[PDB]
Symmetry: C3
Subunit: 174 residues, 3 copies
């Protein structure tokens, strides 16, 4: 059962859930905390590789994945990242997030950006008990026009669901 | 923890969750209420704009978004909407939905349409405590062939999860 | 509220949730059971049909869908299935899954494959109370390069949420 907004504020106070920087009350509502776009991106350069073998020898995998991914792109103040129709790109939330062993996060993108084509990371919704860090975001433009994305914009909504008990093998321990 | 079918029927009876028109027992099963496709659509006309700036000056934004979106398309009885491969379109559920401050909805599309390419709105699953209205749907054809969509068809499944208490800032109040 | 890893192990022991073959402790962590890719695939052959009418006369529907879908593709040991950019394909989990009437499953794909383009089945997350069987997976490559998928690879994560009571009309009974 999701935490309502005021229980989120509670868990943040007790020190049992951490979100950094801490979002003000404006950005905690209903059952979600709004999260923000960070300033570190990546694109793909397919030309160096014929395919990616997901389940294969971690040698060739490491090095193939090293070829295909752009170097980190960091945008100066007031600069957009243009995500063109049909492009997949990686970015990161502005906020860091630390979950205890008895809470799981679910990240949704914003419905109003998805109406213009933005699918964020959408084969995976789940932030694990124990997770501590930024969240890697995978964007895909499924609309006709390019979409300009600026660091600081609202990019998603985080909701939190207590588990039936504290996980034995959370992220930090395993 | 999701409401099972018979608790959904309960909450609808107590007057604590509203779905309009009210779906019969056929369309409430397991842990979901089947929802239906409405009769109001939109497509994109990119030609008037170079991009969309999501986080930018609400003036230019309003007017850019005014250009790019088709006018409302309403289908006469017995008429299909053809969603061609690679097209993003907006539609609406037939049913209206009103949630109390201590319940959150999650909308999934139907697995059997997704097997033919239909991604519905899938960067966002969440209907907020306090939401009252139709649900805007964003479709994308990810398959090879066009898909004919007729108002009244089953288009999704709504499930409901009580919150840990009533939200302080639900949709209606904020 | 999701089952943590050790409650999943409990429900599997009590005989109240079944996953076959049973995954070892390595593959149950936090709040999910890792699931594996099976060895039965399908692709599309659009050339025989102009469109698919989802909501139409189950005669023509059966036969149209019979045309468009490839025959079952079964991969010999050590063989990949190449899913090319922009292709939608169907596969199946290696594990079978049987849920009781008071538990609902949610399947997420893996975040690390989605970073390379793999959207799995993502308009639908939900395994119903009463479901018993393999899970049909719908893949879509949203990246630049083809992705090689081998039977046995990790393909997803299953999490489980008790309902507010046992469903009256679960999958097996309705
Ligand atoms: C997921 C979804 C939500 N909504 C509704 C439910 C939410 O309560 C509300 C807002 O969802 P939200 O994801 O917060 O998007 P936004 O950027 O508009 O705030 O809109 C839809 O109309 N359609 C959808 O497909
Ligand atoms: C989400 C998902 C569900 N299922 C199963 C689980 C559900 O219990 C069942 C039905 O899901 P549902 O979304 O109701 O699709 P449909 O139009 O076939 O009724 O199929 C899959 O086989 N694969 C999937 O990827
Ligand atoms: C869904 C999501 C998860 N994560 C985090 C949360 C999870 O705790 C963790 C692992 O998610 P998981 O789906 O298990 O992917 P993987 O193949 O890497 O194990 O990564 C992200 O960084 N970004 C995301 O978009």
């Amino acid at each position: 059962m999701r935490l309502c907004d005021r229980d989120i504020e509670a868990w943040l106070d007790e020190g049992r859930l951490s979100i950094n920087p801490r979002p003000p009350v404006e950005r905690i509502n209903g059952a979600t905390v709004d999260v923000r776009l960070g300033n570190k991106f990546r694109t793909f350069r397919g030309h160096t590789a014929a395919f990616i073998d997901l389940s294969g020898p971690k040698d060739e995998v490491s090095a193939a994945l090293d070829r295909v991914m752009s170097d980190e792109i960091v945008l100066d103040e007031g600069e957009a990242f243009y995500l063109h129709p049909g492009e997949l790109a990686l970015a990161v939330t502005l906020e860091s997030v630390t979950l205890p062993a008895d809470l799981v996060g679910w990240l949704d993108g914003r419905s109003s950006l998805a109406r213009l084509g933005l699918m964020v990371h959408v084969t995976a919704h789940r932030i694990d008990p124990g997770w501590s860090g930024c969240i890697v975001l995978a964007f895909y433009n499924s609309g006709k026009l390019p979409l300009a994305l600026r660091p600081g914009m609202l990019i998603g909504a985080l909701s939190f669901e207590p588990l039936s008990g504290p996980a034995v093998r959370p992220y930090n321990r395993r």
